Design a protein around this ligand. Structure first.
Ligand code: TYM
Lengths: 362, 388
């Protein structure tokens, strides 16, 4: 029992209600994604503003990012992108994806070239998620900073309105930290304003931003929202989601690089079970879907609501065993991961380059 | 002890800051005769008076610059200025005159940084206001006669967004300097904006050749020489320790003393002060007026006294100004000896100075008028220079 209602108030966000979900549905003319109608993406901030702009034929855009990783990207990392891809499709709005290679360089043991390299590679995985090349700008901080007539200006503006004491509290920086880490929050914030991308929005500063993110990141995004009116820009809207369960609750998680046999082995051997120790005692008391990692993953990926609920009931009653549940998950992940690998393999250096080239979108 | 940093120059001494002593504190090298000669031979020209008179008395690795030069290996100059709305006085000319001379005798490329972003961060203006001041000051800079074909003047706000190498070097430098370190060097506090805290990386960046691909392609081995009053040393003592950590050569330095304030050599000429400066905008009348009515005097209070005791050149601002702008050495020594003897009276010894400063300020004001927008724009345009 995690409890997210104690978080909506802890941060001051606005819990998304069955009422808000309906306006989205009416505005998009499509059934709400399962993350919504399942509470994956529960809370938000200013979502109604976005709809106001949209319904009244006024465009808005999406912003999300990732810290280029030299390591593997697991299924958990897909949640944000899947939702953003959906938002992008149903609203048909531009999307900018920031690869914070400068950030990784500042925090990890990498040369500037290696950081950039990890960014271009992670870019393939992101493109693999299926984003439309005609309305998605994926950019490396290291590359785009030197080719934007608006980005650095916004960074300087933000840097002037944020003090060390403020970032010390929000991010825990110390006196021993390099000056690059200390001013980085401005780089991460700048993408929230439309005129940071002249090639896409030009001089416009009204096209509001929408940022899908994790609930426990709301404090960080508060900095950006607080600086917005201070420098004359609309605050970016937010859509919060729950956390992704850890495997145990190496084999730390299921990476998008694992094979069918690897997935199978990870689940059946490491997926934390909320079921009983013996098959006799399990049918006796049932399983706990609340803490059963295997079922939790199903809530994220299994798209059939009925098929999902049926599993919850059976596992809870004790009818379905753990190994059987694990088989239900493995049969959903293998094709998930499999398809990702296929799409990624078809992403050429040409395609990557086009996604990462500042240009007019549609 | 004296106090000099990128923002303030204070001393309880009339004879000004104690150089040869600041050389130790800052840990630098004295420019000796041997070096002066080496520069004469390498350039086939007479050493500028700043060197001849000890105006530029300190250096860092000038010998490495010469080693390279004498071996057909290029090098470039870098200096800059924080744009202002009304500033830009005579004292400012010192590093720009010397830089211009270095550019002409060595015939090397030069980049000049206008820190409009620094001003935007430390002042209370808008981006457009900061950039505006950058352009205006560019006119004054160009007026010193820098060769358009070998000089790149750039606004940080503008160049940062159009350089495939500037920002990457900012980031590199940023990783190798701690808040703690910038606290000790520049005295920043936890209350300052993050922009101020990381700014030192932006001023260090021009010290490296690949920050300017349009000029040096992708070469990282082009030695850099930074002529600057010694008040800009902090930025570069920091930059020098960082250089090898990011695989670049350390920038060389040539330190100039401070142009005394009208009221006295206790501070450097500062536009931030009421009437301690002779601005490059002052009319011929304002110049003589400020010299007579404000230029501190080292000559006895009265003529009788002056005749018997003489005058102190070490503290007379008028004479100090002459060591900077009176080109003729013998004439300078004659004025020195006569003022020291009493033969010459404080009585418009200032006249001599006024005869020097008036044409000086006038020549600049004139050349400044010739600065067209097509001109400023060409200077501030990233482009290949007259080299390879
Ligand atoms: N009273 C004085 N007497 C003699 N020289 C003086 C006096 N006051 C100023 N200077 C010199 O003038 C140059 C510009 O000063 P700034 O304060 O604009 O300079 C600034 O505020 C820097 N952030 C701009 C900068 C960027 N890169 C550089 C590289 C070298 C030197 C300067 C820069 C400087 O060379 C300075 O030493």
């Amino acid at each position: 029992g995690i409890d997210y209602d104690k978080l909506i108030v802890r941060f001051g966000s606005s819990k998304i209600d069955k009422e808000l979900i309906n306006r989205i549905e009416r505005a998009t003319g499509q059934r709400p994604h399962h993350f919504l109608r399942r509470g994956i993406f529960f809370s938000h901030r200013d979502m109604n503003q976005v709809l106001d702009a949209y319904e009244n034929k006024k465009p808005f855009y999406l912003y999300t990012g990732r810290g280029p990783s030299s390591e593997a990207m697991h299924v958990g990392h897909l949640i944000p992108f899947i939702f953003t891809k959906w938002l992008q499709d149903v609203f048909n709005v531009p999307l900018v994806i920031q690869m914070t290679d400068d950030e990784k360089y500042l925090w990890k043991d990498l040369t500037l070239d290696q950081a950039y390299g990890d960014a271009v590679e992670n870019a393939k995985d992101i493109i693999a998620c299926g984003f439309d090349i005609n309305k998605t700008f994926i950019f490396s901080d290291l590359d785009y900073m030197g080719m934007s007539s608006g980005f650095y200006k916004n960074v300087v503006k933000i840097q002037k309105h944020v003090t060390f004491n403020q970032v010390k509290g929000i991010f825990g920086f110390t006196d021993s930290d390099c000056i690059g880490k200390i001013s980085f929050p401005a780089i991460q914030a700048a993408p929230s304003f439309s005129n940071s991308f002249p090639q896409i929005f030009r001089d416009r500063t009204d096209i509001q931003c929408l940022i899908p993110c994790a609930i426990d990141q709301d404090p960080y995004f508060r900095m950006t929202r607080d600086v917005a009116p201070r420098i004359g820009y609309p605050k970016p809207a937010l859509l919060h989601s729950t956390f992704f369960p850890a495997l145990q609750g190496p084999n730390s998680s299921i990476f998008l690089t694992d094979t069918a046999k690897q997935i199978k082995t990870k689940v059946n051997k490491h997926a934390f079970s909320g079921g009983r120790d013996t098959i006799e005692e399990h049918r006796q008391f049932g399983g706990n879907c609340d803490v059963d990692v295997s079922f939790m993953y199903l809530t994220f990926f299994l798209e059939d609501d009925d098929k999902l609920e049926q599993i919850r009931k059976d596992y809870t009653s004790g009818a379905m065993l753990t190994g059987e549940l694990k088989k239900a998950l493995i049969e959903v992940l293998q094709p998930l991961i499999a398809e990702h690998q296929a799409r990624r393999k078809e992403v050429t250096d040409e395609i990557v380059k086009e996604f990462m080239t500042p240009r007019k979108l549609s």
